[PDB]
Amino acid sequence: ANFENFIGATEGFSEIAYQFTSHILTLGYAVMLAGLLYFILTIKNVDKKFQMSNILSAVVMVSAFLLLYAQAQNWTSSFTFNEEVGRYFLDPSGDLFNNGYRYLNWLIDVPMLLFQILFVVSLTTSKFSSVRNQFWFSGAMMIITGYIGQFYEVSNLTAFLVWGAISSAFFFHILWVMKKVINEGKEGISPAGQKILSNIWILFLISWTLYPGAYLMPYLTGVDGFLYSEDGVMARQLVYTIADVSSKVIYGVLLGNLAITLSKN
Ligand SMILES: *C\C=C(C)/C=C/C=C(C)/C=C/C1=C(C)CCCC1(C)C
Numbered sequence: 001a002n003f004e005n006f007i008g009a010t011e012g013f014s015e016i017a018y019q020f021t022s023h024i025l026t027l028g029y030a031v032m033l034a035g036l037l038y039f040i041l042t043i044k045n046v047d048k049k050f051q052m053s054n055i056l057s058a059v060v061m062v063s064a065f066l067l068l069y070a071q072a073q074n075w076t077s078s079f080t081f082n083e084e085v086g087r088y089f090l091d092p093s094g095d096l097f098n099n100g101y102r103y104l105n106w107l108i109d110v111p112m113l114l115f116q117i118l119f120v121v122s123l124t125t126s127k128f129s130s131v132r133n134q135f136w137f138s139g140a141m142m143i144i145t146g147y148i149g150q151f152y153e154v155s156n157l158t159a160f161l162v163w164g165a166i167s168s169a170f171f172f173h174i175l176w177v178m179k180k181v182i183n184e185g186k187e188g189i190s191p192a193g194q195k196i197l198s199n200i201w202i203l204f205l206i207s208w209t210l211y212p213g214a215y216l217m218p219y220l221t222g223v224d225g226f227l228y229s230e231d232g233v234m235a236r237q238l239v240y241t242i243a244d245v246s247s248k249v250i251y252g253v254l255l256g257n258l259a260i261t262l263s264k265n
């Protein structure tokens, strides 16, 4: 199956990696619910013209709360403790750990996160529907091909890399079109609003690069090594959670500041 299943069915998890991974994943869905409330309550401090941005943040949190709750209970109900051996092991009766909850929350969210900037800033030379269509297509294909490649994380590894690599090409296209978007969005706004735009670019750049980092994490130190272990599991799932807070919550928080700043023309 995946690589988490491998460790829980050949070596187990110490009670310190199981609970750490259950606490940081629960942190993940709790945040999403505080961002659901924050975005609703803030829908007023922005003009009607930018409110579709906040709405899209509200919906993105509804799908993040629900599905990250799922992934969280998918990890805790997939491993049972062995007092004899003293570690946590894959449970044959449970449903096994399954990434598909996360990856699905990615495919729902990517049009929305990408589409929403185009309600705050104004393009100059590009065409709205041209940018929109390019985002929805490559965003969807990125998450899809990345959902394929990680199926073989344990089996065909050359598949795991080459399919992720394909998912990375769509990712670099998105980065291109976001980059052009940020740029035209700076034309004819204040220096203050331009500073915030610059923030949303460094935030978009780091948060989104984290994801393939988690994808590869157990293989970043060889065929065996430090990470080829429960430690790379602890690490891959802590990185994913920081990426989910950064790209969905801090991203929308920042975009709300810009809208607010642009309310004062
Ligand atoms: C939760 C919201 C968003 C926008 C999530 C984005 C996730 C990625 C950009 C993940 C990308 C991948 C890459 C670059 C290559 C391997 C497969 C991944 C899906 C992990």
Ligand code: NA
Binding pocket: 002, 003, 004, 099, 150, 153
């Ligand atoms: Na996995």
